[PDB]
Design a protein around this nucleic acid. Structure first.
Ligand SMILES: [Mg+2]
Ligand SMILES: [Mg+2]
Ligand SMILES: [Mg+2]
Ligand SMILES: [Mg+2]
Ligand SMILES: [Mg+2]
Ligand SMILES: [Mg+2]
Ligand SMILES: [Mg+2]
Ligand SMILES: [Mg+2]
Ligand SMILES: [Mg+2]
Ligand SMILES: [Mg+2]
Ligand SMILES: [Mg+2]
Ligand SMILES: [Mg+2]
Ligand SMILES: [Mg+2]
Ligand SMILES: [Mg+2]
Ligand SMILES: [Mg+2]
Ligand SMILES: [Mg+2]
Ligand SMILES: [Mg+2]
Ligand SMILES: [Mg+2]
Ligand SMILES: [Mg+2]
Ligand SMILES: [Mg+2]
Ligand SMILES: [Mg+2]
Ligand SMILES: [Mg+2]
Ligand SMILES: [Mg+2]
Ligand SMILES: [Mg+2]
Ligand SMILES: [Mg+2]
Ligand SMILES: [Mg+2]
Ligand SMILES: [Mg+2]
Ligand SMILES: [Mg+2]
Ligand SMILES: [Mg+2]
Ligand SMILES: [Mg+2]
Ligand SMILES: [Mg+2]
Ligand SMILES: [Mg+2]
Ligand SMILES: [Mg+2]
Ligand SMILES: [Mg+2]
Ligand SMILES: [Mg+2]
Ligand SMILES: [Mg+2]
Ligand SMILES: [Mg+2]
Ligand SMILES: [Mg+2]
Ligand SMILES: [Mg+2]
Ligand SMILES: [Mg+2]
Ligand SMILES: [Mg+2]
Ligand SMILES: [Mg+2]
Ligand SMILES: [Mg+2]
Ligand SMILES: [Mg+2]
Ligand SMILES: [Mg+2]
Ligand SMILES: [Mg+2]
Ligand SMILES: [Mg+2]
Ligand SMILES: [Mg+2]
Lengths: 141, 129, 149
RNA sequence: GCAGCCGACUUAGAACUGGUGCGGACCAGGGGAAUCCGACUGUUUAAUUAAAACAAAGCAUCGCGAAGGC
RNA sequence: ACGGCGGGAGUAACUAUGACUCUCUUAAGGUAGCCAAAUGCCUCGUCAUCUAAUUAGUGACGCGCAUGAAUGGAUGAACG
RNA sequence: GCCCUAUCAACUUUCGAUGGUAGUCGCCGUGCCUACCAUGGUGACCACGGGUGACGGGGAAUCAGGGUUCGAUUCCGGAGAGGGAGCCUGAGAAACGGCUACCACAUCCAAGGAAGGCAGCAGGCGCGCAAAUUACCCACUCCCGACCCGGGGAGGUAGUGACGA
RNA sequence: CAAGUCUGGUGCCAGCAGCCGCGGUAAUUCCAGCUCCAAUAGCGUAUAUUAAAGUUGCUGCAGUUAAAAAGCUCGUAGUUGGAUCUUGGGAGCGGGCGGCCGUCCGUCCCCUGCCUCUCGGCGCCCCGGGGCCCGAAGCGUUUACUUUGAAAAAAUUAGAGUGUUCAAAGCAGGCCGCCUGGAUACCGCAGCUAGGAAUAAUGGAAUAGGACCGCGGUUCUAUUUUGUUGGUUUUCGGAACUGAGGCCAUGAUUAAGAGGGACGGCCGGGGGCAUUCGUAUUGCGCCGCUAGAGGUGAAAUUCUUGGACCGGCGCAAGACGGACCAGAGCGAAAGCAUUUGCCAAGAAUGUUUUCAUUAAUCAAGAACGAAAGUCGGAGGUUCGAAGACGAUCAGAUACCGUCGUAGUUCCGACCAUAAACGAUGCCGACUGGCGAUGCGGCGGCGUUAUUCCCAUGACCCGCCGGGCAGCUUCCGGGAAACCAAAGUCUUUGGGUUCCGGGGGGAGUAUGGUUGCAAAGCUGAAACUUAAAGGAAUUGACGGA
RNA sequence: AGAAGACGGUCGAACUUGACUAUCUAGAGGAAGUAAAAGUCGUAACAAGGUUUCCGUAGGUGAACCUGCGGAAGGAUCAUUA
RNA sequence: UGCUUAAGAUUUGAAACU
């Protein structure tokens, strides 16, 4: 503080009440248009419909082509690059299905080596992907 | 300019210790300051001082012993009830053994150990140890 | 700390501890009162009075010999002007400046000192409108202060 | 600061009454949203063309010191 | 001051209009800016809107048979 | 005695705004409303206007001391039964498991006409990342009535149940 | 961050990984075996969120160089404001410093007003008189602050009691008809009560309509009694109005190393208007002799026998004021140097003058603000954006060289931005020295001129104020360079203004607004990234 | 006692015609911006970076950038003699 | 006593007490 009087309360509180707005985690979470422009809209999962299978290069020291799925959502109608986590599990995804997308884990931020991919895939066609990968379950034919 | 004379005296009595002086002069004579020094004298932190009288804000010459670590002053002045004086001496003093928060009341200026005797609280002026 | 200047000067009088009177001053408390009724009736400011009185009469402070000070003495008879003298000389100054600006448009400095004299006027005149030596409808109007010479 | 005399026209505010009719005849501007050309006023093909044409203010070039320039 | 402002085919690291040029012969070789306009043959050019339905209108694209800078180019209240 | 915003700094007032007088209505006090006069009232100590993924309070989670965030949800108190206005009986309701009309949604018809309102318990449609049995009973706690004696999907007991402890 | 350099496959491919990081033919990190770990009927992965975060900072942050103090003063709200008014006396006990006082310390108790010579007098001492000591009835002209007292829905939480076989719960139950239990505490901000009077605000008498204390006048009203009862008059009082008086110790705190104001001699490139001088630069004129002169590293465009360049005499014009000029002065900052004159202003010092808190910092709203740039007018020496040209170069639309418009200068209207930098807000003090330099002042040996010397000038040695500075240092701090402040800071608080919260997107969009235009003041997000940046150390490197 | 019924006043939902808060569509493509192991033409910056750099302002140029007029040292000078 | 002197592909480093 810099002023230290006995009745200087509307100066202190109308100074902190302005300078809180220059925080980053207060401004993104609290009032503002981030909850407006969230593709999920302030929730932790979202269903979607696949429209295409594409791959993405990796950044520096690394040299590979990671695998991603262009998804259009139900509740808004926007478009998302997802991510296929495990090995070879692109060959179980056929066109025009439903996938259950979960956020990645750095709170909407680019991760690792992959340039600009926020969201990942958990379930495919109401069949859990760890079982479809392992073998406990089987795709409904 | 000078909004508090007691607050420019406890700093003028703070800067003579870290140098290592023996005697010092203060310019205004408050009746508050005089009741303050005669609070520190009863605990023997300093010697016996004296006041110099012109027909103005008189002066004071203080003799200093070597038991005075730091004399302070609180700004602004507050109100301290009996359930706050614990939370001031919790975090404004080194230990619970010594150190003396001093505060005026409607009964006079006294320390907190006495304010527990008289069951009284009032406005705070400072602290010394 | 000055008002409108960055100076920090220290130069003034210093009265000693000894208030009391000298011995060679045989003048009475009311003979000095006639010396003052003489001088102010002729016309002189209260400060120049206390200069003449310690240059041709040998008195240090008039408060120490009489009971009250100079203006308060004059005040109980009726010889004091209504506006005080320091306001009078800050109007005579703001007039001789507004005249110099009127004959000189390109004088930015006298343009700058005029605003500050105007502030020490509109700052005094509300000390006097609370000490109540003036009616609350006394106003330093700019272009008519020269009538109140 | 009051009395008495003469005297011109207007403006405002209420009340009543008529079959919703009242600027009762005459007199008396239809309007909005956009493009092209020209700045406007003004002028002309008297007797088929009055305009988007010429003019115009502004702007810019050229010759010439008198036996000379046009 | 009248007047003039074309050409040689591709250069990359997947379409590929095309980077950067290639390339230079007879005086330099269409910059800023505007458009199917009162100037654009192919022509009712293509796209969106105006309509139940629009060879006309309005907005955009430019490869302009043959747009363009005092032979004036782009501009914008009032007025007709 | 309250949340965000000055990219809202001037507002209200013959369309009652702020007051005086006499009345009308109404359970009573008042611009609540008429009739006549006066021109005033709030505001940088943040009025006015706008937002709110705002129902408020008792309280819950983490915490040295200070505090931040959450309180739709079993208790108290108010609001509302698709949206808005109107009124009867009655001590008490502008009531909706009571009536009269409009708008929107909607049923049976012999085509002349008739009737309706789950944000009551169950259960489906829908929207969704997202949430259970169209079961049994007045015995418990209590409420209603003309009343020891008849009723109550209020309520209780079971079924689903990896919220969690 | 607890735990395999075990074995077999792929070979920057497929893939793991929250972060650093692994994979290109022997991978402890990949797909699998074996083995190993942490939690265990539960465990991971998303999202919202609190602590950690003194990375939102009232307790408790930063602002010289890293993100950071408006270009500068003025200024209404606001916030904060110097010193000063009442000291005391006895009653008792515990106790030890000392030759029964005590010098006594500790601690409790007692010594506020009458409005009650009208409440109205409960007792109680005093000698029908009022009367003492003293329960209460009903004011005692204030807030702010502090303590007490009532009042505050349950549940919840914290908490005693109990052995549901323990436990989370629950309020029951324990003995041979009996005995109980079902507690307490806590409960801000305001309002009511009741005491407290340090601090912090605010009051009276100075045109004296002054505050009591009585004598005189004029208008008034209520009752009991002059028997019962009707005009009138008083007493007694309870309201105004009003004449001369007496009286108080009869009334104005001090004059800040806070501030305003007057006077006094001085100072300075401080500011405005007028006056004057100076070489030079270009140009022009007439003379004097002759083939080159400019100009670069080297040359050429350029000038020249109609006489250039140099030399002398003259003459016009418009700018600029060197050398004297320094870590010197002034000004709020930008800024200010020829002589002379006029108009008013201002610092510092001197002051035994004056008024007596008039002050400090400052939201909105205002004045000034170098250069360049704009619209007008005069004036156009020299330089000179744009431009043309000659070389250089692979190419130069650039540096180099000749010419050159707009401008550079003056008066008048605008615009308000700079590394406007000391890259360090303003007021306040405080805490070490050492030499200097500049104005005003205080003394002093002595030289120097005036000569006829006190006094004025020039040196020399000291003191004091404040003004730009400087060396030196273990005050002290700091990440360090470095600072008498960037110090008095975990031993954290003197007052008070503006502003920053990772980097970029971006001082952009939009919305307002001032401006003739150029542009300026307010001023976000979407997305995107794990580093960008400051100070010192070593090495290699330099056409240093 | 009173069934229908009407005069006008009141309360007034609802209907055709003007302004504000928040949300959306083709969206030109004109224009941007960022981000992607290896492209083209160049050399502005860091050493005196080979013309010392950097801010403010105007004008120009394929691109970085150039050139003027008053600043700053975050520079390669804490200094240059009577 | 100073003339010119443009350029150079993407990846690849880590330490314990007895
Ligand atoms: Mg603080
Ligand atoms: Mg990374
Ligand atoms: Mg001030
Ligand atoms: Mg058009
Ligand atoms: Mg015409
Ligand atoms: Mg004709
Ligand atoms: Mg005709
Ligand atoms: Mg073109
Ligand atoms: Mg059109
Ligand atoms: Mg053409
Ligand atoms: Mg032209
Ligand atoms: Mg409620
Ligand atoms: Mg805390
Ligand atoms: Mg918090
Ligand atoms: Mg209720
Ligand atoms: Mg009704
Ligand atoms: Mg109702
Ligand atoms: Mg029903
Ligand atoms: Mg319905
Ligand atoms: Mg409901
Ligand atoms: Mg029943
Ligand atoms: Mg029920
Ligand atoms: Mg179960
Ligand atoms: Mg781990
Ligand atoms: Mg958090
Ligand atoms: Mg920080
Ligand atoms: Mg910085
Ligand atoms: Mg600055
Ligand atoms: Mg600035
Ligand atoms: Mg309650
Ligand atoms: Mg006070
Ligand atoms: Mg000179
Ligand atoms: Mg401002
Ligand atoms: Mg000009
Ligand atoms: Mg030039
Ligand atoms: Mg060039
Ligand atoms: Mg100029
Ligand atoms: Mg100008
Ligand atoms: Mg400032
Ligand atoms: Mg940021
Ligand atoms: Mg960095
Ligand atoms: Mg390559
Ligand atoms: Mg460079
Ligand atoms: Mg250089
Ligand atoms: Mg350079
Ligand atoms: Mg250039
Ligand atoms: Mg140049
Ligand atoms: Mg530098």
């Amino acid at each position: 503080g810099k002023c230290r009087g006995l009745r200087t309360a509307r100066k202190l509180r109308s100074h902190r009440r302005d300078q809180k707005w220059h925080d980053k985690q207060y401004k993104k979470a609290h009032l503002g248009t981030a909850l407006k422009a969230n593709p999920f809209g302030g929730a932790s999962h979202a269903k979607g419909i696949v429209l295409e299978k594409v791959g993405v290069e990796a950044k520096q020291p690394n040299s590979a082509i990671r695998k991603c799925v262009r998804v259009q959502l139900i509740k808004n109608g926007k478009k998302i690059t997802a991510f296929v986590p495990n090995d070879g599990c692109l060959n179980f995804i056929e066109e025009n299905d439903e996938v259950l997308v979960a956020g990645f884990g750095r709170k909407g931020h680019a991760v690792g080596d992959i340039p600009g991919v926020r969201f990942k895939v958990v379930k495919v066609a109401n069949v859990s992907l760890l079982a479809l990968y392992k073998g406990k379950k089987e795709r409904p034919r | 300019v000078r909004m508090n004379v007691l607050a420019d005296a406890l700093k003028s009595i703070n800067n003579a210790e870290k140098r290592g002086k023996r005697q010092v002069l203060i310019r205004p004579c408050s009746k508050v300051i005089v009741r303050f020094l005669t609070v520190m004298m009863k605990h023997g932190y300093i010697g016996e001082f004296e006041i110099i009288d012109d027909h103005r804000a008189g002066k004071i010459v203080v003799n200093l012993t070597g038991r005075l670590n730091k004399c302070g002053v609180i700004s602004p002045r507050f109100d301290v009830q009996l359930k706050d004086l614990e939370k001031w001496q919790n975090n404004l003093l080194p230990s619970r053994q010594f150190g003396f928060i001093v505060l005026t009341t409607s009964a006079g200026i006294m320390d907190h150990e006495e304010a527990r005797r008289k069951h009284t609280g009032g406005k705070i002026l400072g602290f010394f140890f | 700390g000055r008002m409108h200047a960055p100076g920090k000067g220290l130069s003034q009088s210093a009265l000693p501890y000894r208030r009391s009177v000298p011995t060679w001053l045989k003048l009475t408390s009311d003979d000095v009162k006639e010396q003052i009724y003489k001088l102010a009736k002729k016309g002189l400011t209260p400060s120049q009075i206390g200069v003449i009185l310690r240059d041709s009469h040998g008195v240090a402070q008039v408060r120490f010999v009489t009971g009250n000070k100079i203006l308060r003495i004059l005040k109980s008879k009726g010889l004091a002007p209504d506006l005080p003298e320091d306001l009078y000389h800050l109007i005579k100054k703001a007039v001789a400046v507004r005249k110099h600006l009127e004959r000189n448009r390109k004088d930015k400095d006298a343009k700058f000192r005029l605003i500050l004299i105007e502030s020490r006027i509109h700052r005094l005149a509300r000390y006097y409108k609370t000490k109540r030596v003036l009616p609350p409808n006394w106003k330093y109007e700019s272009s008519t202060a020269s009538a109140l010479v």
